[PDB]
Amino acid sequence: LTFESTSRFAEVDVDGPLKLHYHEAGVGNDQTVVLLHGGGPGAASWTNFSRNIAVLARHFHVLAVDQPGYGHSDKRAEHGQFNRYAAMALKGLFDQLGLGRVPLVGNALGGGTAVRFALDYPARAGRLVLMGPGGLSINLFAPDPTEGVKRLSKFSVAPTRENLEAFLRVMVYDKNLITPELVDQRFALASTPESLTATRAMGKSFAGADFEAGMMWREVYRLRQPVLLIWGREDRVNPLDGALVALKTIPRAQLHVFGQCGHWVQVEKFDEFNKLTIEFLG
Amino acid sequence: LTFESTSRFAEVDVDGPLKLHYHEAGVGNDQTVVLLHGGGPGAASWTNFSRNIAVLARHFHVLAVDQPGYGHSDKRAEHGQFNRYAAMALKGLFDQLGLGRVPLVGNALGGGTAVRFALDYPARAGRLVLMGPGGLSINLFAPDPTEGVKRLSKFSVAPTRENLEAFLRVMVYDKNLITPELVDQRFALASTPESLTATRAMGKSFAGADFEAGMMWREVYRLRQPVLLIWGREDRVNPLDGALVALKTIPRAQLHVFGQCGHWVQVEKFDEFNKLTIEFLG
Amino acid sequence: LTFESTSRFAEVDVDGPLKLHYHEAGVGNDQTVVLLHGGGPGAASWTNFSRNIAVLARHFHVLAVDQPGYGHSDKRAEHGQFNRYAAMALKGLFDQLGLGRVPLVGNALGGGTAVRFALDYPARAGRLVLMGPGGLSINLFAPDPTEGVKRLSKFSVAPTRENLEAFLRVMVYDKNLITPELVDQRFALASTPESLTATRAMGKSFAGADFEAGMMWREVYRLRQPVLLIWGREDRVNPLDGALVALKTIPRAQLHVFGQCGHWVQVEKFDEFNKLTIEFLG
Amino acid sequence: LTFESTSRFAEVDVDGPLKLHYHEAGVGNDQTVVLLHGGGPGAASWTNFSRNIAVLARHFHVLAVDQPGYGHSDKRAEHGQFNRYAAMALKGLFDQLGLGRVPLVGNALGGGTAVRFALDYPARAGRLVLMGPGGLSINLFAPDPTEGVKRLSKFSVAPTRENLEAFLRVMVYDKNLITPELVDQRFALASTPESLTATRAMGKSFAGADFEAGMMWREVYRLRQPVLLIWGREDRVNPLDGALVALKTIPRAQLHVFGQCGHWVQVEKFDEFNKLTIEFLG
């Protein structure tokens, strides 16, 4: 299991050709699971789910998809509401790979996409595992934009190493996790012209008239599958209070909260997260 | 594994002799775990943890203790703040059985006792698993007394079958769980003179000057072990909002919430609860 | 100011003739305000706003409207989603009386109607004052149905004096407010054949396909006027946690909470409520 | 009413002589009220309560006290838990001026001091008005330190104009309120050697063994007077979720929340705040 051995590309149709990069592992396992990574301008499937893919691959057929604008998937200069955009791409991939109904694992931005997908193509989404998910969260107490959102916005405005480091440091409870080699690695990816284009496209999409598609806390009462919401108690991007509406309105919801854990649950509580997910997904 | 095969008695000292009834199972397993049952006038270890003891016994050395006033333990006509009272009894049992530091599983009233014990004898309590625990909960939004508390109070005032049934029905999300044979069984136990005495003793203890000992939400910031808070989203006795202070202030806290689950988590989500507990306790 | 001196009738069109009863006071005052009373089968404008109408009339032109199914307004044997139904009736009254844009004061059920109206006829609703409002509230922590809702349902099933008293007692923090003469008065009104018909119509309307119209917490982000949410900390019908979504999503929201106050804010904190409303409404 | 006309000094005893600066107005009014300003290294009574003192002086005898470490009061290089320290100073002033029981108005840091005082000298504190108060607040959902706390800490570490501006901008919902002349004014005050000393003393006091004195959310259940908690919905220093424990546990609590209002309630909602306070204080 290396980046290269698991790398795959697909071309799907979303208002024309869109190249999607993904990682495939655990081929031969019966149950397929799709993983959808978090935000942050230099983020991608492989780095996001580094402490997870190999473990999950022992039990599942794992497809970890780079979301349009990220990793090695296409980075268009414009799109509509992002989650609906990425969900359209995912549907294309489902159809192309012949997937029927499949559980989705999504963090942050990727949680919003898993939810958008599960709402837009209800028959295609099985059980959901969502870690500090965007979109379905609404921060009832935390003033928006939150500190995590503001720090990401600052980088988008001024893409400096310093701004990326300040952003990364609010992703985690244990800030020692934010090493110089981590910062340098993400910055190199984050600061490419193509990443800058994606960041620009994202910012512009917020001002779209299809913004309601992002307010998924209004819709999740319609979800019929079990949904495991997982949060870091110390999430500074999508804070804990953002879990409440989804917890209340999703009939088969569960919530697990980890103390001493920031926004990156899959990293900071990787073992606990792994086992929770394996058990939940059968 | 039957009531009789696992039944044990111990005499401990709490201002004089106090007989404690408990159940022992999984002898030969290395890790001891103590289970502390919930409230409700006819409740006891064996019925409370019916869907749990055998499963947990496969992995642990289980000691499920009838709390003073319940089951086959002594039912004194008076005592001080209940959780501190039961914690004193438990300490006596720990010493007598030669237990050192041991994880505690407690629901409702028994969760309050596990917490009181863990605060009063800090070296003796290991990891805690607490299901809709009293004492450390403070219902920030729900007006007190809650519906569950009021229904229990009504029975204590008028110990009729009808009042017990109304009380039992707010213990669970799935009210079909409250069968006639369940009601009759609990009522027979609940309505003994000795149970009535215990109920009377309990009511009187509320008016004690040691009431602060019950306000454990003020103290749990001192707990140093991992603590897994487990709640039924639909708990009508100790509702979900009562989890917040404990979640925020216990450094190593986790919270798991089950949708479509009432106050009796160990019954309504028995399999999920069992696996969560086994994993948490190593 | 007596019931009789202020009594008025109007016939409006809601799928045919609908008679609305209301009270008019403070004629000659420049600013019109519409008051919408709470639920409870024997409730009406005059009794609901007894400690309020005369005070408010000193400053405003007050129109306190009996909502269809209540007081001396028509009690049809069937209707759609209640708030939308009552809002349709109110629109008819606005048009008929030549009202333009007017502030609305609504408690409980009447708060839901004020909100439905403000959403359906956006140009016609000015500032809103909403006391423990239904509809826009969603109880993020309290299991539904709440104790207040359950007690009302029990009466609807078994319309006995005893059941009405149990219901009334969860309307207030100070239960001494629930006197025998109050109970008898409400029961006489509550137990008429026509009230029973309205109760029956209401129960049936819940099962309608237009239920979304009642989930107003999904829509209030669209409200553009100042909105003063007022709650009794001890509200056992629509508890405090039900305020959160509306507080977060209404751009110009305020919230005032009274400790030692139940569901009937306008009664239990009548002076404070009166002054708050007068100030808020200019 | 100018700074100079209202300026007063007093020498009180807190482990030796401590000079307190305060402003006196509305002399001849019967009801005395004490105002306690917020934090921020260059803050003081006069600037904190600029939009308030003259208005309140029409109705009350106002004493707005510079808290030790601030304004023209003594700035010692060391002290214990700050709120208890300031409360000791205030007691000295009460005794010296012959005040008996007097209502307290406190924001932020000053709210914590009003509360500490009301707990330590229960007979001396009347009704409390507390705006986004420190100390009694505990942020059940917001990870600590909050963005406001972090920005203040950054200035304390690196006292630059830029850091002060970033801090000030999270004090308000309307960031246009943070003008260049405001920044320059606060920075000049904030960056004096004596202010730096106070900041240093404050930071050091956090590490004291008397830290429990700051955890006032544990004690406010003991307050017997009416308490009006006032919050800006968008408070980024002491966010709204920090109001809950105090709201629940203070028997005679009220809460008022203003949407579109940050941490500086007394500035951003000055008129509404003024009227609320005047009414509450009789």
Side-chain angles (χ1 to χ4, degrees):
Chain A
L1 275 348
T2 62
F3 179 113
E4 297 84 9
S5 83
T6 62
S7 182
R8 309 278 189 270
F9 290 96
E11 189 182 284
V12 296
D13 168 55
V14 180
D15 288 329
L18 184 64
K19 183 185 54 180
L20 283 175
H21 182 249
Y22 62 102
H23 298 270
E24 181 170 32
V27 171
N29 287 326
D30 287 329
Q31 180 63 77
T32 302
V33 186
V34 167
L35 315 194
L36 305 178
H37 61 83
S45 294
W46 194 253
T47 54
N48 212 241
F49 290 117
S50 60
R51 306 235 186 110
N52 323 111
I53 288 168
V55 173
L56 296 172
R58 302 164 189 161
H59 303 109
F60 304 108
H61 172 231
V62 173
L63 300 170
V65 182
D66 287 350
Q67 269 162 290
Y70 295 91
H72 291 92
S73 296
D74 271 353
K75 301 181 183 195
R76 292 184 181 171
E78 93 181 20
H79 49 74
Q81 201 282 333
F82 183 85
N83 301 117
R84 172 153 284 157
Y85 172 51
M88 281 180 183
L90 190 54
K91 171 67 160 53
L93 186 67
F94 269 60
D95 286 339
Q96 187 165 312
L97 301 177
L99 307 185
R101 174 160 70 84
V102 163
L104 302 150
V105 185
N107 69 87
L109 186 57
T113 296
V115 171
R116 190 71 264 161
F117 181 89
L119 291 166
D120 292 357
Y121 317 98
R124 306 306 278 281
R127 299 181 124 139
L128 307 177
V129 178
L130 309 167
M131 309 87 84
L136 71 47
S137 46
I138 172 165
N139 313 327
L140 299 175
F141 295 102
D144 298 300
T146 61
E147 181 175 25
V149 171
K150 285 201 285 177
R151 298 224 179 251
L152 176 51
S153 288
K154 201 188 183 182
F155 180 84
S156 306
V157 163
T160 66
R161 187 193 186 280
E162 296 68 32
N163 289 341
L164 189 68
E165 178 162 9
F167 161 80
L168 287 169
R169 287 177 66 85
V170 288
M171 301 292 101
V172 295
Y173 177 73
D174 180 5
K175 306 194 216 176
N176 290 346
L177 292 170
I178 310 301
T179 62
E181 39 281 306
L182 180 56
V183 174
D184 294 337
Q185 192 271 330
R186 295 299 208 270
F187 185 65
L189 289 184
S191 64
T192 73
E194 69 262 29
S195 292
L196 299 179
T197 294
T199 293
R200 179 165 71 248
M202 181 74 76
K204 168 92 65 53
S205 72
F206 298 147
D210 55 357
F211 63 90
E212 275 191 28
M215 302 167 75
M216 288 170 252
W217 53 271
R218 301 195 324 123
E219 297 175 68
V220 293
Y221 75 92
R222 294 193 275 114
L223 296 178
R224 297 184 193 184
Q225 62 266 78
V227 170
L228 176 59
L229 306 165
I230 306 169
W231 242 272
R233 176 180 63 193
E234 286 82 10
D235 193 323
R236 295 176 176 265
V237 184
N238 300 327
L240 182 63
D241 50 310
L244 300 182
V245 173
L247 176 57
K248 172 73 187 193
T249 61
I250 301 173
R252 300 163 85 184
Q254 298 175 43
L255 173 68
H256 200 97
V257 181
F258 293 109
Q260 304 179 341
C261 183
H263 184 56
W264 287 353
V265 169
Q266 85 282 5
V267 170
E268 283 199 283
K269 292 290 168 171
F270 72 97
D271 200 52
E272 297 88 348
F273 167 74
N274 286 342
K275 292 173 182 171
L276 225 34
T277 297
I278 290 162
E279 180 63 19
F280 188 67
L281 296 190
Chain B
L1 275 348
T2 62
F3 179 113
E4 297 84 9
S5 83
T6 62
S7 182
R8 309 278 189 270
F9 290 96
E11 189 182 284
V12 296
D13 168 55
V14 180
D15 288 329
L18 184 64
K19 183 185 54 180
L20 283 175
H21 182 249
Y22 62 102
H23 298 270
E24 181 170 32
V27 171
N29 287 326
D30 287 329
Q31 180 63 77
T32 302
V33 186
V34 167
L35 315 194
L36 305 178
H37 61 83
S45 294
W46 194 253
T47 54
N48 212 241
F49 290 117
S50 60
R51 306 235 186 110
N52 323 111
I53 288 168
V55 173
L56 296 172
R58 302 164 189 161
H59 303 109
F60 304 108
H61 172 231
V62 173
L63 300 170
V65 182
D66 287 350
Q67 269 162 290
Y70 295 91
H72 291 92
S73 296
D74 271 353
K75 301 181 183 195
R76 292 184 181 171
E78 93 181 20
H79 49 74
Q81 201 282 333
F82 183 85
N83 301 117
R84 172 153 284 157
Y85 172 51
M88 281 180 183
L90 190 54
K91 171 67 160 53
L93 186 67
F94 269 60
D95 286 339
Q96 187 165 312
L97 301 177
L99 307 185
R101 174 160 70 84
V102 163
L104 302 150
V105 185
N107 69 87
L109 186 57
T113 296
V115 171
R116 190 71 264 161
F117 181 89
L119 291 166
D120 292 357
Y121 317 98
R124 306 306 278 281
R127 299 181 124 139
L128 307 177
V129 178
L130 309 167
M131 309 87 84
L136 71 47
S137 46
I138 172 165
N139 313 327
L140 299 175
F141 295 102
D144 298 300
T146 61
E147 181 175 25
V149 171
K150 285 201 285 177
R151 298 224 179 251
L152 176 51
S153 288
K154 201 188 183 182
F155 180 84
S156 306
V157 163
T160 66
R161 187 193 186 280
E162 296 68 32
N163 289 341
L164 189 68
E165 178 162 9
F167 161 80
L168 287 169
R169 287 177 66 85
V170 288
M171 301 292 101
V172 295
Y173 177 73
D174 180 5
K175 306 194 216 176
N176 290 346
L177 292 170
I178 310 301
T179 62
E181 39 281 306
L182 180 56
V183 174
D184 294 337
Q185 192 271 330
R186 295 299 208 270
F187 185 65
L189 289 184
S191 64
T192 73
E194 69 262 29
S195 292
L196 299 179
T197 294
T199 293
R200 179 165 71 248
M202 181 74 76
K204 168 92 65 53
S205 72
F206 298 147
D210 55 357
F211 63 90
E212 275 191 28
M215 302 167 75
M216 288 170 252
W217 53 271
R218 301 195 324 123
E219 297 175 68
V220 293
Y221 75 92
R222 294 193 275 114
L223 296 178
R224 297 184 193 184
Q225 62 266 78
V227 170
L228 176 59
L229 306 165
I230 306 169
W231 242 272
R233 176 180 63 193
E234 286 82 10
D235 193 323
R236 295 176 176 265
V237 184
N238 300 327
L240 182 63
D241 50 310
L244 300 182
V245 173
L247 176 57
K248 172 73 187 193
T249 61
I250 301 173
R252 300 163 85 184
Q254 298 175 43
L255 173 68
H256 200 97
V257 181
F258 293 109
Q260 304 179 341
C261 183
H263 184 56
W264 287 353
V265 169
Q266 85 282 5
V267 170
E268 283 199 283
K269 292 290 168 171
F270 72 97
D271 200 52
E272 297 88 348
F273 167 74
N274 286 342
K275 292 173 182 171
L276 225 34
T277 297
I278 290 162
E279 180 63 19
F280 188 67
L281 296 190
Chain C
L1 275 348
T2 62
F3 179 113
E4 297 84 9
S5 83
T6 62
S7 182
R8 309 278 189 270
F9 290 96
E11 189 182 284
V12 296
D13 168 55
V14 180
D15 288 329
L18 184 64
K19 183 185 54 180
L20 283 175
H21 182 249
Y22 62 102
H23 298 270
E24 181 170 32
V27 171
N29 287 326
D30 287 329
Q31 180 63 77
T32 302
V33 186
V34 167
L35 315 194
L36 305 178
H37 61 83
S45 294
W46 194 253
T47 54
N48 212 241
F49 290 117
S50 60
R51 306 235 186 110
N52 323 111
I53 288 168
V55 173
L56 296 172
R58 302 164 189 161
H59 303 109
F60 304 108
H61 172 231
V62 173
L63 300 170
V65 182
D66 287 350
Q67 269 162 290
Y70 295 91
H72 291 92
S73 296
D74 271 353
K75 301 181 183 195
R76 292 184 181 171
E78 93 181 20
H79 49 74
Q81 201 282 333
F82 183 85
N83 301 117
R84 172 153 284 157
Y85 172 51
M88 281 180 183
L90 190 54
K91 171 67 160 53
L93 186 67
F94 269 60
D95 286 339
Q96 187 165 312
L97 301 177
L99 307 185
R101 174 160 70 84
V102 163
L104 302 150
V105 185
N107 69 87
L109 186 57
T113 296
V115 171
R116 190 71 264 161
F117 181 89
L119 291 166
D120 292 357
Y121 317 98
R124 306 306 278 281
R127 299 181 124 139
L128 307 177
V129 178
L130 309 167
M131 309 87 84
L136 71 47
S137 46
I138 172 165
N139 313 327
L140 299 175
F141 295 102
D144 298 300
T146 61
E147 181 175 25
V149 171
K150 285 201 285 177
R151 298 224 179 251
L152 176 51
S153 288
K154 201 188 183 182
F155 180 84
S156 306
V157 163
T160 66
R161 187 193 186 280
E162 296 68 32
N163 289 341
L164 189 68
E165 178 162 9
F167 161 80
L168 287 169
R169 287 177 66 85
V170 288
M171 301 292 101
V172 295
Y173 177 73
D174 180 5
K175 306 194 216 176
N176 290 346
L177 292 170
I178 310 301
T179 62
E181 39 281 306
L182 180 56
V183 174
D184 294 337
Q185 192 271 330
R186 295 299 208 270
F187 185 65
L189 289 184
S191 64
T192 73
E194 69 262 29
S195 292
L196 299 179
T197 294
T199 293
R200 179 165 71 248
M202 181 74 76
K204 168 92 65 53
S205 72
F206 298 147
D210 55 357
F211 63 90
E212 275 191 28
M215 302 167 75
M216 288 170 252
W217 53 271
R218 301 195 324 123
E219 297 175 68
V220 293
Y221 75 92
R222 294 193 275 114
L223 296 178
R224 297 184 193 184
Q225 62 266 78
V227 170
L228 176 59
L229 306 165
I230 306 169
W231 242 272
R233 176 180 63 193
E234 286 82 10
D235 193 323
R236 295 176 176 265
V237 184
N238 300 327
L240 182 63
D241 50 310
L244 300 182
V245 173
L247 176 57
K248 172 73 187 193
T249 61
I250 301 173
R252 300 163 85 184
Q254 298 175 43
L255 173 68
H256 200 97
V257 181
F258 293 109
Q260 304 179 341
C261 183
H263 184 56
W264 287 353
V265 169
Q266 85 282 5
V267 170
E268 283 199 283
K269 292 290 168 171
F270 72 97
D271 200 52
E272 297 88 348
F273 167 74
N274 286 342
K275 292 173 182 171
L276 225 34
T277 297
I278 290 162
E279 180 63 19
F280 188 67
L281 296 190
Chain D
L1 275 348
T2 62
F3 179 113
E4 297 84 9
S5 83
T6 62
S7 182
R8 309 278 189 270
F9 290 96
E11 189 182 284
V12 296
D13 168 55
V14 180
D15 288 329
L18 184 64
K19 183 185 54 180
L20 283 175
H21 182 249
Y22 62 102
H23 298 270
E24 181 170 32
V27 171
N29 287 326
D30 287 329
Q31 180 63 77
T32 302
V33 186
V34 167
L35 315 194
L36 305 178
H37 61 83
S45 294
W46 194 253
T47 54
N48 212 241
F49 290 117
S50 60
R51 306 235 186 110
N52 323 111
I53 288 168
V55 173
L56 296 172
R58 302 164 189 161
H59 303 109
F60 304 108
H61 172 231
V62 173
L63 300 170
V65 182
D66 287 350
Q67 269 162 290
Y70 295 91
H72 291 92
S73 296
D74 271 353
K75 301 181 183 195
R76 292 184 181 171
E78 93 181 20
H79 49 74
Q81 201 282 333
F82 183 85
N83 301 117
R84 172 153 284 157
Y85 172 51
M88 281 180 183
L90 190 54
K91 171 67 160 53
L93 186 67
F94 269 60
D95 286 339
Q96 187 165 312
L97 301 177
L99 307 185
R101 174 160 70 84
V102 163
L104 302 150
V105 185
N107 69 87
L109 186 57
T113 296
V115 171
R116 190 71 264 161
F117 181 89
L119 291 166
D120 292 357
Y121 317 98
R124 306 306 278 281
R127 299 181 124 139
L128 307 177
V129 178
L130 309 167
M131 309 87 84
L136 71 47
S137 46
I138 172 165
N139 313 327
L140 299 175
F141 295 102
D144 298 300
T146 61
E147 181 175 25
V149 171
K150 285 201 285 177
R151 298 224 179 251
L152 176 51
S153 288
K154 201 188 183 182
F155 180 84
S156 306
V157 163
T160 66
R161 187 193 186 280
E162 296 68 32
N163 289 341
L164 189 68
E165 178 162 9
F167 161 80
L168 287 169
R169 287 177 66 85
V170 288
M171 301 292 101
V172 295
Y173 177 73
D174 180 5
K175 306 194 216 176
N176 290 346
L177 292 170
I178 310 301
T179 62
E181 39 281 306
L182 180 56
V183 174
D184 294 337
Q185 192 271 330
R186 295 299 208 270
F187 185 65
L189 289 184
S191 64
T192 73
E194 69 262 29
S195 292
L196 299 179
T197 294
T199 293
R200 179 165 71 248
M202 181 74 76
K204 168 92 65 53
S205 72
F206 298 147
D210 55 357
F211 63 90
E212 275 191 28
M215 302 167 75
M216 288 170 252
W217 53 271
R218 301 195 324 123
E219 297 175 68
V220 293
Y221 75 92
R222 294 193 275 114
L223 296 178
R224 297 184 193 184
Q225 62 266 78
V227 170
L228 176 59
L229 306 165
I230 306 169
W231 242 272
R233 176 180 63 193
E234 286 82 10
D235 193 323
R236 295 176 176 265
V237 184
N238 300 327
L240 182 63
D241 50 310
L244 300 182
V245 173
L247 176 57
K248 172 73 187 193
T249 61
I250 301 173
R252 300 163 85 184
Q254 298 175 43
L255 173 68
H256 200 97
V257 181
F258 293 109
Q260 304 179 341
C261 183
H263 184 56
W264 287 353
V265 169
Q266 85 282 5
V267 170
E268 283 199 283
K269 292 290 168 171
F270 72 97
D271 200 52
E272 297 88 348
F273 167 74
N274 286 342
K275 292 173 182 171
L276 225 34
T277 297
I278 290 162
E279 180 63 19
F280 188 67
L281 296 190

